Design a protein around this motif. Structure first.
Motif, mmCIF file in Angstrom:
data_model
loop_
_atom_site.group_PDB
_atom_site.id
_atom_site.type_symbol
_atom_site.label_atom_id
_atom_site.label_comp_id
_atom_site.label_asym_id
_atom_site.label_seq_id
_atom_site.Cartn_x
_atom_site.Cartn_y
_atom_site.Cartn_z
ATOM 1 N N UNK B 85 0.825 -1.212 0.000
ATOM 2 C CA UNK B 85 0.000 0.000 0.000
ATOM 3 C C UNK B 85 0.859 1.262 0.000
ATOM 4 N N UNK B 86 1.788 1.332 0.944
ATOM 5 C CA UNK B 86 2.695 2.464 1.021
ATOM 6 C C UNK B 86 3.523 2.591 -0.252
ATOM 7 N N UNK B 87 4.099 1.479 -0.692
ATOM 8 C CA UNK B 87 4.887 1.456 -1.918
ATOM 9 C C UNK B 87 4.148 2.146 -3.055
ATOM 10 N N UNK B 88 2.890 1.754 -3.260
ATOM 11 C CA UNK B 88 2.091 2.314 -4.348
ATOM 12 C C UNK B 88 1.959 3.820 -4.194
ATOM 13 N N UNK B 89 1.547 4.260 -3.010
ATOM 14 C CA UNK B 89 1.427 5.692 -2.753
ATOM 15 C C UNK B 89 2.708 6.457 -3.087
ATOM 16 N N UNK B 90 3.847 5.933 -2.651
ATOM 17 C CA UNK B 90 5.120 6.574 -2.953
ATOM 18 C C UNK B 90 5.431 6.588 -4.449
ATOM 19 N N UNK B 91 4.815 5.683 -5.200
ATOM 20 C CA UNK B 91 5.037 5.635 -6.641
ATOM 21 C C UNK B 91 4.326 6.768 -7.357
ATOM 22 N N UNK B 92 3.360 7.381 -6.679
ATOM 23 C CA UNK B 92 2.668 8.535 -7.233
ATOM 24 C C UNK B 92 3.669 9.660 -7.491
ATOM 25 N N UNK B 93 4.338 10.101 -6.428
ATOM 26 C CA UNK B 93 5.313 11.183 -6.532
ATOM 27 C C UNK B 93 6.603 10.795 -7.249
ATOM 28 N N UNK B 94 7.081 9.581 -7.028
ATOM 29 C CA UNK B 94 8.268 9.135 -7.738
ATOM 30 C C UNK B 94 7.975 9.052 -9.239
ATOM 31 N N UNK B 95 6.699 8.881 -9.579
ATOM 32 C CA UNK B 95 6.264 8.781 -10.975
ATOM 33 C C UNK B 95 6.957 7.669 -11.745
ATOM 34 N N UNK B 96 7.278 6.580 -11.057
ATOM 35 C CA UNK B 96 7.900 5.430 -11.704
ATOM 36 C C UNK B 96 6.868 4.510 -12.332
ATOM 37 N N UNK B 97 7.251 3.849 -13.435
ATOM 38 C CA UNK B 97 6.455 2.846 -14.147
ATOM 39 C C UNK B 97 6.144 1.651 -13.259
ATOM 40 N N UNK B 98 4.934 1.118 -13.376
ATOM 41 C CA UNK B 98 4.561 -0.089 -12.652
ATOM 42 C C UNK B 98 4.079 -1.153 -13.622
ATOM 43 N N UNK B 99 4.605 -2.365 -13.491
ATOM 44 C CA UNK B 99 4.165 -3.464 -14.347
ATOM 45 C C UNK B 99 2.797 -3.912 -13.875
ATOM 46 N N UNK B 100 1.942 -4.299 -14.809
ATOM 47 C CA UNK B 100 0.604 -4.742 -14.456
ATOM 48 C C UNK B 100 0.284 -6.070 -15.107
ATOM 49 N N UNK B 101 -0.148 -7.022 -14.295
ATOM 50 C CA UNK B 101 -0.521 -8.329 -14.799
ATOM 51 C C UNK B 101 -1.984 -8.533 -14.481
ATOM 52 N N UNK B 102 -2.747 -9.002 -15.458
ATOM 53 C CA UNK B 102 -4.157 -9.274 -15.227
ATOM 54 C C UNK B 102 -4.401 -10.770 -15.251
ATOM 55 N N UNK B 103 -5.242 -11.243 -14.339
ATOM 56 C CA UNK B 103 -5.716 -12.611 -14.388
ATOM 57 C C UNK B 103 -6.762 -12.673 -15.473
ATOM 58 N N UNK B 104 -7.092 -13.872 -15.938
ATOM 59 C CA UNK B 104 -8.056 -14.020 -17.027
ATOM 60 C C UNK B 104 -8.855 -15.320 -16.914
ATOM 61 N N UNK B 105 -10.029 -15.349 -17.545
ATOM 62 C CA UNK B 105 -10.910 -16.525 -17.517
ATOM 63 C C UNK B 105 -10.274 -17.754 -18.164
#
Lengths: 145, 146
Positions: B85-105
């Motif tokens: 949770x904290x990590x994500x919030x700090x990524x707002x200001x750092x403006x760093x890229x985040x990898x995103x993986x989606x689950x699927x049917x």
DNA sequence: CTGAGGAGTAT
DNA sequence: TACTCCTCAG
């Protein structure tokens, strides 16, 4: 879902993760220590076990391994069901069981064993625990180191 | 432990298991949806998230994804601005890229890189606090197949 | 060690 | 939905 040897997996082969074992068909469950199937007929038979730590399994440097059944650890009696039952049925069916050991890569394929017998024990809590005696089938490679 | 793109992993690449993602360095935890590291030098920043189901999060057909924070849901309690949770919030200001993986049917797709635009807190009926993170997909990347 | 944590699969 | 010799960062 195979019984006994699995193509291209040699004794002493090592792995980092329980799911690597799944991908190769050595052991399917991601956590459960016992893996089994249904026989032509109706019954369950074990195909593989994983001995890490957790349950008080007795293994050292011999051909014999004492494996603890799953369940109960509020503590309660273990049940002759699923894996536990599968193992027991493997006694009479006399089928080969794959054995993976955890290690201080965290897993080694240790070859094939047979379930020689089982019995039940009683911890201090008062609850029932199963123990399975497995013996390594003769003739297989030994473990490195 | 990398930030942004990971060598030899293309948008749209698929996987069957959470550990495949680990083996390739896309996402390390075996279950935790949020993955992070320490910056130089250095607080927590997110490096990847996994959106399957479970944590009621908003994954429509857009460049925007609303991601639920972890914790509290056993008896419900406020989520805490810690770890992921904290990590994500700090990524707002750092403006760093985040990898995103989606689950699927194959149950997982690499969906490219996003930025954490903002966060806010919500209150379920139980009365307890939940975090929500708004992420937006960085423009210019391939689209998803099918 | 200790358990939080968008697991994995059969049942 | 149960269950479970996980996994790793605090």
């Amino acid at each position: 879902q195979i019984i006994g040897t699995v193509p291209g997996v040699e004794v002493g082969d090592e792995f980092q993760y329980r799911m690597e074992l799944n991908l190769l068909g050595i052991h399917r469950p991601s956590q459960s220590g016992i893996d089994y199937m249904k026989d032509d007929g109706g019954e369950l038979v074990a195909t593989s076990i994983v001995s890490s730590g957790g349950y008080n399994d007795v293994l050292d440097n011999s051909d014999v391994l004492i494996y603890t059944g799953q369940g109960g650890n509020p503590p309660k009696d273990q049940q002759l069901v699923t894996g536990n039952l599968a193992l027991k049925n493997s006694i009479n069916k006399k089928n080969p069981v794959r054995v993976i050991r955890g290690i201080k890569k965290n897993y080694v394929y240790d070859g094939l064993y047979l379930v020689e017998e089982y019995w039940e024990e009683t911890g201090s809590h008062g609850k029932l625990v199963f123990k399975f005696k497995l013996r390594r089938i003769p003739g297989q490679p030994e473990l490195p180191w």
